[model samples]
Target: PLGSTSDILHRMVIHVFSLQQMTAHKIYIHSYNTATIFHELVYKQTKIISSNQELIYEGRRLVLEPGRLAQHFPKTTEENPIFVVSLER
Candidate 1:
């Protein structure tokens, strides 16, 4: 029984360089954020092209850009951060 959840504001951290270490950029995302929006935010801090970069949310690669933020990634109460990786390597 889910109620009105589209109105929630989700704040998350972009843990860049998941290959190495560092809890990089932190930003707030709407519960229904688009893929472009997510990529754009990461670009601002890492200076990496959204097309060249890939995002790993929860435990899998986030490929469904057409879906909302919360659609692909489930919302939680913990300080879970997004993982940024390269598509080239």
Candidate 2:
């Protein structure tokens, strides 16, 4: 039982914007993971830096926080995902 693993997973769609181009990618998360980790997930897959990116949900910017993905984007799915856009700041 110990060390045996079958962690619950959540699928998320990522729409990362670079200038005029948009890239879509999907990532699997632990559902209970934090937004900070979610940012890293995208970075690891897309090679986008955390400081150069900002997360948005439904046109509202999200705080760079330790809040769980379950609370931040509870409705996220392969079809519906939060947005990350590039900023020069």
Candidate 3:
């Protein structure tokens, strides 16, 4: 089993990344209330533009913008930030 909470969180991060790869162009996770209310939808760029949601392609903390949609893209690292994952496109 995971040794501690940190380890668990780390594993979750890893799993999230893995899922991201598997569903890059297949699915995307929409969140609100810090990922409290969310759902998966078939990957589509135009959908985001058409809806009130926005993709949060950066950062660590999750943000739920009421009446606004945002996509989450975790930063790989502090030094080399904002590297868009190509497999997702």
Candidate 4:
């Protein structure tokens, strides 16, 4: 089989913070795709709230920062993982 499909591996942990619950934890994302794609998928799976609600991580809002996001993905690994994803007002 020369051109058959194969299972590619991509793994990451996204810690989504629930400010109301006062919780911080990791969301394990394992997929047969690129980190960027998997991240998008995982992000969509997480809970999202209205504009009134807030989510914070490391003193910054969870609203995607292009520079930070670029620094994170395609280079993140199991050993050096992506920390958290929070909500912001």
Ordered list by TM-score, greatest first: 2, 1, 4, 3
Cα displacement (angstroms), candidate 4, residue 20, comes to: 0.5
Clashing pairs in 4: 55-87, 55-88
Which numbered prediction scores highest in lDDT against the true structure?
2
* TM-score against truth, every candidate: 0.56, 0.63, 0.21, 0.36
Per-residue C-alpha lDDT of model 2 across residues 1-89, encoded as one tens digit per residue? 22112353343333443332466666556556667777777787667786767777667786655676644554655455567776754
For the record, the alpha-carbon RMSD of candidate 3 to the native fold, in angstroms, is 14.3
Q: CA lDDT, every prediction?
A: 0.57, 0.59, 0.30, 0.42
lDDT of 4 by residue, 1-89 (tens): 22112322344455554444444445454433343543454455444333333434455544443233332533334343334444454
The residue-by-residue lDDT of candidate 1 on 1-89, one tens digit each, is: 13332344453433434432354565445555666776776677667777877776677876745545634554433256567786665
The candidate 2 region of ten consecutive residues with least summed lDDT is 1-10
lDDT of 4 at 56: 44
TM-score of 2: 0.63
Error of 1 at 37 (Å): 0.9
Among the numbered candidates, top TM-score falls to 2
Q: lDDT, candidate 2, residue 21?
A: 42
Q: Candidate 3, TM-score vs. the true structure?
A: 0.21
> What is the clash count of model 3?
7
